């Protein structure tokens, strides 16, 4: 999963 930013 990619970080929020």
């Amino acid at each position: 999963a990619l970080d929020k930013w």
Partner: antibody
Amino acid sequence: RITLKESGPPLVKPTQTLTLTCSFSGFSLSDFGVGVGWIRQPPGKALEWLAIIYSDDDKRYSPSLNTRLTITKDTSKNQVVLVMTRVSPVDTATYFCAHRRGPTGPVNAMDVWGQGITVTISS
Amino acid sequence: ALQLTQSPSSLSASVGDRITITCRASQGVTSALAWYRQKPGSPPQLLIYDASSLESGVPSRFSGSGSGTEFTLTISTLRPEDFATYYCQQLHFYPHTFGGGTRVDVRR
């Protein structure tokens, strides 16, 4: 400015649940993109990422501890709570909560940390 | 899982020395890497964010560089208060991994 402080039981029994609270001031979990994460450190070991919660209740947990952790936030009290179940002696460590800046680059770090609370797991 | 490898894990130096320390990531993390200094008994303290940005209030001797999978933290001239443990952290992928740390002690 921003400050955070971890509180909870310094002593916890093997098998029992650990509940920790992060109380903060100087900022608020309402303000967009802001996050409050938890990081632990076993005596003499390296830092270990536990979880993080954001302004929009968005949430993430460390995969390995996912079925044992629950993180929540109460905007009325500026507190973030971490609940860790079925703890064992290996969970003995210093638990820190930290602040993560929101989109103003500066989001790439945990800029302010609590003093940390020492938790010992023994029967 | 994404692994962050710090090298060297332990390093001895003297006041006035120039040292450079590295953090390697198993996968590209763009510029999402932070460096922290941790003195014993105290919590980690942010030095560099976004891989190369010097955090406000942090002394000029500290600097960072890198992108993708390779990153470094350099201390132009270490001071007595720099004998501590340093950690890097990537915030590109969840979970937000920390490296194993680099211990800097006094050489004799």
